[PDB]
Design a protein around this ligand. Structure first.
Ligand SMILES: O=C(O)Cc1ccc(-c2ccccc2)cc1
Ligand SMILES: *[C@@H]1O[C@H](CO)[C@@H](O)[C@H](O)[C@H]1NC(C)=O
Length: 340
């Protein structure tokens, strides 16, 4: 069990003005820290955010949060469930800003909701330094879905925050799960993100912002465009046929759809060709790293916890311990280890 702490700085809030927070489980014999960003879509205007407030309120407010949460998958402390980092300090950061972790705007006379995802991450790091993070050797910022995109948007800012605070020895790294999307043609007929950024006062990494410039920051929400600009090491986990990618493409088999789906897998494989640390199975699924059975899937005979351990060794090519694992077969579930 991870225990809830609401932020001491009560000006850093969820959408409705209630305090943000984090769930923590310490491991006093470890210098590794895992900070995980929850996912869950987003909202981009008043009417669409009001709808989410009615039936997805735990993603907009801390008022009903439980005092504890069970750590699962990579957040599990049992070696059998988590061969990778079972002895690490574990942090689960709930997603209650509906802004893909990009916002920096308070609730005010002119704003019905607060969008503070980027400031939530910064404040969690700040308060954790007084609970042990000051002694860390590695801080892994991880996340699934919208939290996976959040890793790409925020990993370099966490690294810069710690350098300016006087902690140059903590190695900051990223793990982005199910957050690597394509701005492709739909099967049946980017605007929502463009409007979202203005609604949220969204912020993107600095080098990417300077490339695309004013009005075009939406580009930095797409993995294959923002990743080459990042300086921190980032491991990318991405199903080739992601269910949320297919949803935004209006896919739910004859030749037209077969060719569409095969081309989608090929395009995703191409964007990952020069990503040295990556895990990309040919499955129709969504999210993996906090699922209890996340140890089950394999690419070319190597599991995800093993690939992550090999990544750890590479940051000290390795014989029999690979870090770049991308399927080549062209149809969902051509890999036998895909989730049932
Ligand atoms: O959160 C989910 O369960 C699915 C999901 C993941 C990422 C994004 C996303 C938003 C903006 C830019 C890129 C990705 C949207 C939905
Ligand atoms: C609380 O957070 C806000 C927003 O990031 C910041 O401006 C303020 O300085 C913080 N307060 C303290 C005491 O650090």
């Amino acid at each position: 069990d991870l225990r809830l702490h609401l932020l001491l700085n009560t000006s850093v809030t969820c959408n409705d003005g209630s305090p943000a927070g984090y769930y923590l489980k310490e491991s006093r014999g470890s210098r590794r820290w895992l900070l995980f960003l929850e996912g869950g879509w987003y909202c981009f205007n008043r009417e669409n955010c009001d709808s989410r407030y009615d039936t997805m309120r735990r993603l907009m407010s801390s008022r009903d949060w439980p005092r504890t949460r069970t750590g699962t998958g990579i957040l599990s402390s049992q070696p059998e469930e988590n061969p990778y980092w079972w002895n690490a300090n574990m942090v689960f950061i709930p997603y209650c800003s509906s802004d893909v972790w990009s916002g920096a705007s308070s609730k005010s006379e002119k704003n019905e909701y607060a969008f503070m995802g980027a400031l939530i991450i910064q404040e969690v790091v700040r308060e954790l330094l007084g609970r042990g993070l000051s002694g860390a050797k590695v801080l892994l910022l991880a996340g699934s879905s919208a939290g996976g995109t959040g890793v790409l948007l925020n990993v370099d800012r966490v690294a810069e925050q710690l350098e300016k605070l006087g902690y140059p020895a903590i190695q900051v790294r990223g793990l982005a799960d199910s957050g690597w999307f394509l701005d492709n043609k739909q099967y049946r007929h980017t605007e929502a993100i463009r409007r979202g950024i203005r609604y949220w006062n969204g912020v993107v990494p600095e080098r990417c912002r300077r490339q695309f410039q004013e009005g075009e920051e939406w580009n930095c929400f797409f993995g294959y465009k923002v990743y080459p600009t990042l300086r921190s090491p980032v491991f990318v986990v991405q199903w080739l046929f992601d269910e949320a990618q297919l949803t935004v493409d209006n896919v739910h088999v004859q030749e037209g759809l077969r060719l569409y789906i095969q081309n989608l897998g090929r395009e995703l494989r191409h964007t990952l060709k020069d990503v040295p640390a990556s895990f990309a199975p040919a499955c129709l699924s969504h999210e993996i790293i906090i699922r209890s059975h996340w140890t089950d899937v394999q690419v070319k005979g190597t599991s995800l916890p093993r690939a992550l351990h090999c990544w750890d060794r590479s940051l000290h090519p390795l014989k029999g311990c690979p870090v770049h694992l991308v399927d080549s077969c062209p149809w969902p579930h051509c890999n036998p280890s895909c989730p049932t």
